[PDB]
Amino acid sequence: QKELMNRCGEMLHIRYRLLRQALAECLGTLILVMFGCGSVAQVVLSRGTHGGFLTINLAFGFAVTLAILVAGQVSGAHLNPAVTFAMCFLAREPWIKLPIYTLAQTLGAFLGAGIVFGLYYDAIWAFAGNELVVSGPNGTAGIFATYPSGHLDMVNGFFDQFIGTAALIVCVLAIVDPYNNPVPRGLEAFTVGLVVLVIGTSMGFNSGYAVNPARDFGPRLFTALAGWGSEVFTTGQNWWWVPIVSPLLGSIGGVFVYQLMIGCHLE
Amino acid sequence: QKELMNRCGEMLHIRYRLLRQALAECLGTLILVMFGCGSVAQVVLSRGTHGGFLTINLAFGFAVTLAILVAGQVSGAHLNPAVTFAMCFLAREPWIKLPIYTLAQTLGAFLGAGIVFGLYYDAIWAFAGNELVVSGPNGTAGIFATYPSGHLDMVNGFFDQFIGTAALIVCVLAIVDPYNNPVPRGLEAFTVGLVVLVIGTSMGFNSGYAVNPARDFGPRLFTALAGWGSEVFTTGQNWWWVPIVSPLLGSIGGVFVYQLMIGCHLE
Amino acid sequence: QKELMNRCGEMLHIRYRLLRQALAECLGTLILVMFGCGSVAQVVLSRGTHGGFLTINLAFGFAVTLAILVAGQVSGAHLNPAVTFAMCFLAREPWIKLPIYTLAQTLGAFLGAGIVFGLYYDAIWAFAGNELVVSGPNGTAGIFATYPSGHLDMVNGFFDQFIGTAALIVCVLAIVDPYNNPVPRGLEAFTVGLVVLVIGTSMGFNSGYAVNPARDFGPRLFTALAGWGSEVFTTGQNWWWVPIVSPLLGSIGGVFVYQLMIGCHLE
Amino acid sequence: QKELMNRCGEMLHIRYRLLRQALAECLGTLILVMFGCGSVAQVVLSRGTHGGFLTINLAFGFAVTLAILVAGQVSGAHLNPAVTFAMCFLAREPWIKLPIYTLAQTLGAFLGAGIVFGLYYDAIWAFAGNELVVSGPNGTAGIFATYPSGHLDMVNGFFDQFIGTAALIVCVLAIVDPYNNPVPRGLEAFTVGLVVLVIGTSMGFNSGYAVNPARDFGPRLFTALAGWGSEVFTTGQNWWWVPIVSPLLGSIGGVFVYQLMIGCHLE
Prior knowledge:
The structure is a homotetramer.
Chain A: H1 2-12, H2 17-44, H3 53-75, H4 81-89, H5 97-119, H6 121-127, H7 154-176, H8 188-203, H9 213-228, H10 231-238, H11 242-263
Protein name (chains A, B, C, D): Aquaporin-3
Main location (chains A, B, C, D): membrane
GO molecular function (chains A, B, C, D): glycerol channel activity; identical protein binding; polyol transmembrane transporter activity; water channel activity
């Protein structure tokens, strides 16, 4: 039966490399969101019975590792518009793929929310008694997108994502640096996956350590059309744009931090 | 004394390769079930005193790694009829070993339940006061097999295992792909073990993330003969066939997902 | 100042290899017990405030990895009389070092208890109000040695350690097998450290997953002389000999299990 | 745009190697403190809702791994004056960089506290109602620096840090030993990161497993100027000097322990 599989492989073969990389980013971000947002639903819908916040940190951290193992060889497994912006800002990848990856990263993250919604369709609907509440004691929209806590304000929420994304790029840039290799080559999947693991355990209290415009805006746009309504965007004094603008500004901020102390003074 | 050991080794040497691989699968699935179902008994019989659900996720995830380290070099450490079905569907392994591995995977998983039952013989019997209850406040059958929760329905339970198994095959296929190696070769034990770790932390709320017909039907058949009675099969509106049919359909579904976006468009 | 260090190194150089390996086993078991029994004191004296049972599993599992990294190159990091008995039974190491390693493993484990006692000297004494209680609500002897639970009986306690040690040897033998290498060579520290991690999360409910005569009898003998009295040995219907006799019988039982299915039918 | 980046790289290039290593230590300790002290604020300000003590252990343990991945190739990622003192005492690194690294390690740790303070500015101020309390039910100074518990005394606190640092150097020396390599070269980031993980789970109950004069005195000096006042230094019967003097004495104590049993008797 290998003759049919090889025949199907040659027909479905994609000549365009750019579209091949965008297809890998859709599945790479799908795994990250399905295994990440699905973990939140496991600890929110169960009210902590099936795990606490450490379950979210372990699943979100190791979902990046698995997403890198899946789409790393094809597209580089950027998995983040802030990460893609950092690579483009460093003259490492063409600027033409910045909107291509972002469009391919928002998708898949949007699809990953639909998979999580279909995975917990009965639990989500029975959480608030055949109704959808954006936030509160029976809030269900917090599973997909990230929302500020009661203590968090508008100014602190901006710097919460800025520091989270800057610390992500600083650690990511050191891993992907060709001249900075304190670890044998090929272990970039586990090392980058540890960065998201310690970010959730350190800066995941204010909002939910989004630090990813695709991971946040993607499922947030899904919840608007799924039935949560327009209240998703207006929650937290129009919080929806904070996990988008701030991580982009945090990427260039984290690019400068690494380059000024270690990146430029190497070799 | 090495002369006797070498003499015993040559006598016990098995010429048939297929039977050698089936013998490895029996011990490979035995370790997976003994260390997996034993973890559930540690957190169910102790009522959360000796660990929560994160204990189950860590033990189930790392039991696959140890089972791969034990039987990986001999049989490939399929450890799953859905995984074996995916390999056969991809023209990677002969179809003759699909029933051979499944028979060898149900066994060992059945034996692994007996080892767990003998490990917690006093705790299981004293859990309900010298009696066996399939489900409820003193339910003991949920340690071995997986049962749906109160919120889970018949339709959602089918798609809960379908999504769990499809996400397992997608991540497994990327690891075992000869042309998709973002990680140095030989680390397949740890990478696959992380897939089960994040599946339990993401989709382990609805039923218990079976995603393995051998890991579910094996000990479930043990509980029927151990003393739990025929109520094990009739619990949850005849739930016993869901962790069997759905993961098989989820394997081919997950095979298509990986091949269409990354698998076919490689090299 | 390197001249003095090199001069001191040549003077202190040990010609005897057997005594060099015994010295490594004393420090190897010291790290395992200090980081293992110290973890129990962190969650028992704090009444779960500074960690649950998962803290014990992670610390005990990763203490074996660090002890292997410290004494692996010198003595092989057996760290267990049952493991040493398995190697001697397999004609891999001389029988002369079976009592030498056991004497060197009981020591260090005894010293590791003294370090833990001095680490938590104030917490241990203030736990019961300037008194030492072997077991109960204010029990402090359970930190060092392992004691059966209320549900555990004499017969089940024997098979609890037998299954725990047999599963340890089966996974250890597959790692140290020269012809069974599904993982790149040199990762034996992390792979063996995962075996103890999943044993604590699976079979650590009945008694405390001793599965190590040196790790159990060592600090238990320390508690008798530290002030706990002879009640340590008579607790649990003379439980002290169960974590000694059973793991030794479980090592040869686990040796046969691996050899009959995978060990003999290799290459 | 690569022409501008290369032009900027040559201008910003640093000729002095010693200043290049000090710049790496500032960012290396910054990551360790930002991801370490930020984890404490995640579990203290949330009152355990967003994680327990295991969150601190995982974040502190893996922050050393990420800090080594960032500054390991440049300065060696000492990250600890006790570690730097151990290297200088072993005639491995020049004594001239002992005050240079310590000054560069206190900084960054001081800056890491400011980043954590700005990350949780609203949560810290709202924790005690627009006020700063050093210790108590609303204590906020314990996030940055380490303070003794109620049971801990002056004598035990000295030996709590002595044992913690000695066990750290013993495990660190075995990893960085050129002649003691039971693990493939290059995995020093993960192996050292496991040492801090098991130290927090074993000896992190008495004070908070400081075992690092830079990680403790750095943010402690920040809290004095941030608004906590001079009570930070006088808390716990002048505890501030214990995490400074004791780890330095524990480094040479741990140097002797490893050298006498394994270090000297090698090759």
